Amino acid sequence: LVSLIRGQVVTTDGTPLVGVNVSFVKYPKYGYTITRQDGMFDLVANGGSSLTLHFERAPFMSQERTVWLPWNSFYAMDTLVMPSCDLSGFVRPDPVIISSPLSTFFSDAPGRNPIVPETQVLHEEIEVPGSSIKLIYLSSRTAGYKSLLKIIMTQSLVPLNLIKVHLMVAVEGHLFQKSFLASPNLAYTFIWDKTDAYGQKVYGLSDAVVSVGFEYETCPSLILWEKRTALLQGFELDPSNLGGWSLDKHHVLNVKSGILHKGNGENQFLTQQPAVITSIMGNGRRRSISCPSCNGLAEGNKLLAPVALAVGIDGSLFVGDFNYIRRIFPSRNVTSILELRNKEFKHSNNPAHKYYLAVDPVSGSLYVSDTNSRRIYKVKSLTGTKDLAGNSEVVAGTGEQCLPFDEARCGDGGKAVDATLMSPRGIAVDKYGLMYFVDATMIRKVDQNGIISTLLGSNDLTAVRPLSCDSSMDVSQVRLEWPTDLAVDPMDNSLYVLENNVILRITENHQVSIIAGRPMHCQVPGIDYSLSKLAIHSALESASAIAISHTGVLYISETDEKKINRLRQVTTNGEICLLAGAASDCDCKNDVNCNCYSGDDGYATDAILNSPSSLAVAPDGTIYIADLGNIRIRAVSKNRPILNSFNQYEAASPGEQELYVFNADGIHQYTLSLVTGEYLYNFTYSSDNDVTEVMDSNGNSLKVRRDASGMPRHLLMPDNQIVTLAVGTNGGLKLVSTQTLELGLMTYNGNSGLLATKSDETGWTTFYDYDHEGRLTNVTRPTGVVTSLHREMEKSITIDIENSNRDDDVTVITNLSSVEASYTVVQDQVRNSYQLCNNGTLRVMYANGMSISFHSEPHVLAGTVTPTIGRCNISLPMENGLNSIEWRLRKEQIKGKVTVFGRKLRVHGRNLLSIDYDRNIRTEKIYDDHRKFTLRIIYDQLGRPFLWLPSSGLAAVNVSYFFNGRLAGLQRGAMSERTDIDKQGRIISRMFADGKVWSYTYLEKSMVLLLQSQRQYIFEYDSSDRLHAVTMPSVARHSMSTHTSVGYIRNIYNPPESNASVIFDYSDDGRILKTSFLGTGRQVFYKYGKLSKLSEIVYDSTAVTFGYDETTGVLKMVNLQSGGFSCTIRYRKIGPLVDKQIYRFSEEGMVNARFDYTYHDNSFRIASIKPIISETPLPVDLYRYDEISGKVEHFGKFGVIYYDINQIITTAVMTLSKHFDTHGRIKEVQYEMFRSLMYWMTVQYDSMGRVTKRELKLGPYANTTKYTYDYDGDGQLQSVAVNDRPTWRYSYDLNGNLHLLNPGNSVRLMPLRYDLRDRITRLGDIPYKIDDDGFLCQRGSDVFEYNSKGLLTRAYNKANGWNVQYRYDGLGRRASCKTNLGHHLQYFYADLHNPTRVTHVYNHSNSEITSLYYDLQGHLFAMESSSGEEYYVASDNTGTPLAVFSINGLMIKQLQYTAYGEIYYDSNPDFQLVIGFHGGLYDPLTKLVHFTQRDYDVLAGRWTSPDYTMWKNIGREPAPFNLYMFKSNNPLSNELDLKNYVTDVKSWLVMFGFQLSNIIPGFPRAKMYFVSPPYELTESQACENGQLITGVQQTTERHNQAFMALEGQVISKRLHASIREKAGHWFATSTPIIGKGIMFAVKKGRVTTGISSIATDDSRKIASVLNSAHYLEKMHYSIEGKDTHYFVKIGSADSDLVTLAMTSGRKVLDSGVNVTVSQPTLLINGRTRRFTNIEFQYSTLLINIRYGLTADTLDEEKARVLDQARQRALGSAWAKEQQKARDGREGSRVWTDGEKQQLLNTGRVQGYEGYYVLPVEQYPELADSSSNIQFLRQNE
Ligand SMILES: *[C@@H]1O[C@H](CO)[C@@H](O[C@@H]2O[C@H](CO)[C@@H](O[C@@H]3O[C@H](CO[C@H]4O[C@H](CO)[C@@H](O)[C@H](O[C@H]5O[C@H](CO)[C@@H](O)[C@H](O)[C@@H]5O)[C@@H]4O)[C@@H](O)[C@H](O[C@H]4O[C@H](CO)[C@@H](O)[C@H](O)[C@@H]4O[C@H]4O[C@H](CO)[C@@H](O)[C@H](O)[C@@H]4O[C@H]4O[C@H](CO)[C@@H](O)[C@H](O)[C@@H]4O)[C@@H]3O)[C@H](O)[C@H]2NC(C)=O)[C@H](O)[C@H]1NC(C)=O
Ligand SMILES: *[C@@H]1O[C@H](CO)[C@@H](O[C@@H]2O[C@H](CO)[C@@H](O)[C@H](O)[C@H]2NC(C)=O)[C@H](O)[C@H]1NC(C)=O
Ligand SMILES: *[C@@H]1O[C@H](CO)[C@@H](O[C@@H]2O[C@H](CO)[C@@H](O)[C@H](O)[C@H]2NC(C)=O)[C@H](O)[C@H]1NC(C)=O
Ligand SMILES: *[C@@H]1O[C@H](CO)[C@@H](O[C@@H]2O[C@H](CO)[C@@H](O)[C@H](O)[C@H]2NC(C)=O)[C@H](O)[C@H]1NC(C)=O
Ligand SMILES: *[C@@H]1O[C@H](CO)[C@@H](O)[C@H](O)[C@H]1NC(C)=O
Ligand SMILES: *[C@@H]1O[C@H](CO)[C@@H](O)[C@H](O)[C@H]1NC(C)=O
């Protein structure tokens, strides 16, 4: 094409000349330029060919300079200044060039984590109301984000004579020059502003030319130069033009650089993807020698034998097609230009008849050199004349072969035409027009005059020295053995020789050196470290051809003709890698049944070549291969989108299942579904190509209302809502707002475009700091938390990530090479490795020992432009640990259009599942390979799934949509739930299939949910749709608030007319830190360690530690320590899988346990469990599975049969048959023993899935009992009839409290009483007591002791004389139960998939172990004793045991329960059953059923504690609720949820018994929990999963998720409006003390504040006072409900009092913040002190500052706050102890009658004092905790 030249002309000193006439003459093209004051010359010339330039000046010598021009680039010419010394064996410069990585990383959740560590990028977002389209900010899409180039020119060792080092950097016309002095480890970092020489923005990717010169003391005039190329990222295109922000769905394609810039922040550098191979000439068949119809199109045109290739100055490819020389024009047409009369059809593949081509860059002359004719020819006419046989002229040679020892030296010194040649081989023509050629074993020159000479002069055997491995010697010392190909480097102007599998370089200074290949001089032990990526250390296997690109890249052809047929690439850095040609399993030359032609229109590295003979590099950088064996010319091109028949470009995202359509200019037209082919988004533009409308598939249009210049004004949302956009004078988006909400408020750093601040409606301001390079260095939050990023750019780029509040330091190390980008994420000694290879492979090597390898293939629909993960190879650290998953993609085309898109999932060559989409009928067929499962998903005209048609006669699921595409209703047979919406899109009605209607009324931020029973719930909201208050039907108002605190976000819930606050403290990343119950003082502290995983849980006097392995990072230990008692759980793992679980106890009587696990070969499936309880080995339980479905076929002694969705559990003795209805609900259970029916149950449901009828037969001879259930207007259980006779009646409060029941078997109707907080107070005559935290305290004479974690530690009754104590493990599970009546049991959890499931019970009274066996629904069905006894359990639809049968099929126990779980009949009370009502642990003493997180009272029919986490989502999903009610007062039916409407393939598969989790490693296992497990338990399972801190970790996750995706499209199953959710913010935000626009940072306990433009004057006053203060770390407490934080200031308060404009008292600011100035006098440990005290307070948040002058000020305040907290802890502990004595309850210590009386009268006991159990020195957070205090006398 066309190139641009730019250079400077200077004098001797360095002054630019004001008058130089720069001239150039080439073909008919003429031109000249005259330099100005700057001394710069700018010229336009044709690229590729060599151009000579003349310079004219008056008092200076007129000089000429010839240069090799790049094809279509901006050439920066060397500076012009207006020979005796010889450097041989001197050290050449070997620079290490490190470029800043490409911005390929982005965030999956910019709202959760905006930090991209590796590229130091800020990825932010703004959610807008009325649309799912977001506004995205990416800090790399700015002017401030510069391109870096670290050039390490010297190492630790400097050559002795080196004095000066010179540097040159050439980027887009710019020429940077700098001189340095010789120093060890000398480096310079070049910064590019992404502009050209004219100050214009450069888009995409650019090439930099780095030149390093070495000046020696021996010769100061000459400098040893070395040229290297580097890739620099330019400006990213801005598609949306919204003040530096983009629309989430709006993309742009850079057509020139081949980059897909997605609006969501995702950048796809398409040219950096695997290279593509295509056939440009030939059809694999030979043409006739006469060449008939050889003049036409190149593609498919028959060849004979392509032996030579050369690219002309025109861009034409000259083909040495044996007999004829054919020219391929840029128009892709072929014309024969020369016929060689000495070529015969027989000698086509003969090496003796092989000739070589070369193009002269001065004049486009083509030179031919035939080895057989012993001459060199020049083609006369390159257009081809009539007589083609005589279109050549002799350049060199007469035709006769001269003898090796010629006297006249084969005509040297004279004319080339008259001279004689030995055997001419490879030819190359220099920049100056000098012709070079290989003549037998030497290199000969043919100059401009026509005189022949010898460069590498042979026969001088005396001066010849063997080839030096490291140093470079002169031409005279070099001897050549079998040289073939020759080429000139268009960047160096050096000559490259291919000689006996070694490539050598001849510089312009006649210096020879090895560039590629390993000679026998230093073969072994030449290199001790062996394998390396360098070309010098890699041996060449039968090399045949060489080619050099204009960027100095060397390509080497290697052909063995048998199996080795490949093309390798050698980059400027000296690294060698495979470019094309896979290793063929078949012999191409010997084997007759062989095809060595494949891979065309696919990836080059996968393709199989056959005998490559010649290479040539095209103007665009594509490599041409003379594939002689396949009679074709093949092209290895950069991966690029191709213009289709419609003049459009197509790119795709397989992960999002989207296809993007762009016009010829790369402007985004449409987004279609990659599966469905239906339009998802349509983009319309203005005349200036500015985006004005985004129209989705549903008809929702988001209009961008613009100005005539394209300036954005506002967004017109699909609901006709206006979102105001205010762009600043710097061009940056300043404000995003609605008529009520301020969605975003942004400031920028000058005109760089770098986001300085970003605020939301809550007033939360985040501050961003960058370095001079525009890389993110700090992120400061209003919590005072700072995230810091530090870069160290060396041979490897290291980024250090630190947080001010945590010790979780993360470091990312990046090593970029020719083959791969290598990443290492380090957390202490735990190292995770990631490798992103050029072939498209992503390899993860986890610290745990497991490795995952994702492999890319071209997409079947989108082509080579989009690689897809079609293979996944997993490796576990074990004997048979290799696993493999495969996705096989297919297509069906009718009339050139896609009809069917098929995907098949395979494991070890077997089909598991097939997901096929038929575009004609709009159906998605999901089917099994063995006729077991079939599901059809029907899509509507808008491309939305609306109907799910399953097999086995199951009820179909169908959905309704509103006009805007939002889900309107769901239906599954007779069951349906519909909604109606406002004009505002708010739900106004909710209709159920039973006729139940809920109304939703909206009145000024308040919502009123009314039921037909006239029960009313009022939800009061914020502008941000977060709850302020909830009024219950009882008219009791619950209140909530959220506020930014110091180091966390505090969420407060206040019960009605109470100050007993329930607080949930969350970190900035959304992790729980503290759970507080201010009513009694209950606290749970959560700590996170160096691996960013849970490290400690502290509550009361109990400390739970989580130990991780120093190297693997896996959870090794969980240790609970509560004084003397210790409970330790230890794990051993095979990668992330548990293979050993140990239980250890410190207690005297308690027994230990061990569980050994084995896994099935080549899987993640558990094969066996071997238990050892109390050093007594138990029998091994074997697990057998179906390899196609993951179905458990055998477990222990039980066998499982699957038919449709029904299951049969069999043994030689028993058969348990479970029958399910069309809705997947249990309809019949049939338990048979010895071919006789022992138990049968039938369940019948109403339209809504409520149990209406249950028939039960308990025993083979017992009668059948019929139970009928009736529900009230709200679906609450009203009555229960036994054989059509009313037996039970239930009634409820307006709040849903059960206030009337028939207890047990009684006819009597008993009333239940409640308080305003819904806490029970009475059950008939029996009084109940619930504490201020909401926990069960007393039931008449029964006393209950619940700890801070909400676990029952002790329960007793002094009157009835019974006492029960419980012990728990570190994961919150009940470990033991011990009574004063002899009972002592221990519980174990051996099931890895169900960690809350009690699998084994150790009984201390008989020393026997009971093994519990559960069915596929989780219900108990069998038991096995270590004594040899076997029991068979009959369980109901809720998993409640109703009957037990002996080993001989005899009913030994029969239970009858009420609807709420109270036992009224027991045939054998002495037979103790561990599992009770609803599958929990039933206690006959307490009458409670224990589930790991909550306890259930069977007498009251409610939970013993509230689930305060309900408050988190009740605002988003408003519904009738009660904190204590059991299953919405429907205890026999499965809880009603939207999950009952099966709208996803994985959920349909689960129903059919399929367990994809067992066959697809990593696939999510379906959760089988009634009660949600505690945080630490779910965390202990998920901690083995890969972290997501860095960008490479997030890239890996995208690969994992895209591989596990089943359906082509998934619906958003939500019948509620989408709410903008913040991390750790649950409720309506309280006004912050740290105002909007104020920066607040707490680094190592030191406070620093900053101010932005938007900050108010009163907010700046608080900032000024808080600056330079010292925060009392870990010493912040909840005092009288207040979130009090302590600070100290060393100096006088005078300066700060002037700022506050006050002297003393209280002042109220504009925000409402209270400022109190006082001078208190404190008495701490007998020491009196008076100081100034400034207090800042808003609602519960309180910030206190103490002023001092001494250095001990911080230490004195620490001693003051701890003593005050000690007084609070002691005051509370003694009060609680006195209350225990008053109530008649058992105290913490055993007191005598005198001690007890002293406590009752005074409040304290003489000689006794409260001491900390957990030391306050290590646990300062427990300083005010009364539950951490123990009363002891001085005897200890
Ligand atoms: C942890 O370990 C603990 C052990 O350290 C463990 O506690 C022990 O648990 C077992 C099993 O539950 C207890 O044994 C039971 O004892 C029952 C009490 O009966 C006593 O009183 C009677 C007087 O009224 C005596 O006649 C009777 O004597 C019999 O037992 C003696 C053994 O001590 C023996 O030497 C005698 O020869 C004599 O046979 C005894 O002293 C007892 O009732 C009970 O038996 C029933 O249950 C067995 C299964 O558990 C059946 O195999 C057996 O056939 C019995 O069933 C019948 O009775 C039930 C209840 O009435 C009915 O539900 C049945 O349908 C059935 O009824 C039919 O048959 C009757 C005639 O047999 C007839 O009258 C009916 O009309 C009907 O036709 C069992 O042996 C043991 O005492 C506990 N030990 C201690 C120290 O606590 C604890 O459970 C473990 N915990 C966990 C969680 O695992
Ligand atoms: C699911 O499909 C059924 C059809 O099988 C839809 O039911 C129809 O609903 C209309 C009212 O909208 C009634 O007039 C028809 O009589 C119903 N058809 C029959 C015979 O079932 C139903 O609306 C769909 N459900 C949802 C929520 O999309
Ligand atoms: C909830 O309110 C009660 C009553 O206002 C507070 O209890 C009082 O606290 C003061 C100071 O500690 C004592 O002098 C009183 O004797 C207490 N009254 C009684 C009878 O308890 C209580 O501290 C408040 N709690 C919270 C969480 O703010
Ligand atoms: C600023 O301080 C005043 C006074 O301490 C707070 O007002 C008191 O609020 C309580 C509880 O709402 C009332 O019982 C008192 O009667 C109020 N006293 C006065 C004199 O107003 C006020 O709430 C504080 N401001 C904020 C936003 O926390
Ligand atoms: C290329 O060759 C075809 C014959 O195969 C001919 O029809 C066409 O006109 C040619 N085009 C050019 C570039 O002259
Ligand atoms: C920002 O981070 C760097 C990390 O090298 C640190 O040196 C610096 O003190 C930080 N500054 C702020 C704003 O805390």
Residue numbers in the entry: 956 to 1037, 1045 to 2798
What does the literature reporting this entry say, word for word?
Teneurins have recently emerged as vital specificity-determining cell–cell adhesion receptors. The Teneurin extracellular region defines its adhesive specificity and controls both homophilic and heterophilic trans interactions across the synapse. Here we present X-ray and electron microscopy (EM) structures for two out of four Teneurin (Ten2 and 3) ectodomains, revealing a ~200 kDa super-fold with a 170 kDa rigid core.
The most N-terminal domain, resolved in Ten2CT, is formed of seven β-strands arranged in two sheets, one antiparallel four-stranded and the other mixed three-stranded, both sandwiching a hydrophobic core. Residues E1306 and K1308 of this alternatively spliced region form multiple hydrogen bonds across the interface. The anosmia-causing mutation (P1610L in human Ten1) maps to a highly conserved area in the Ten2CT shell (P1680).
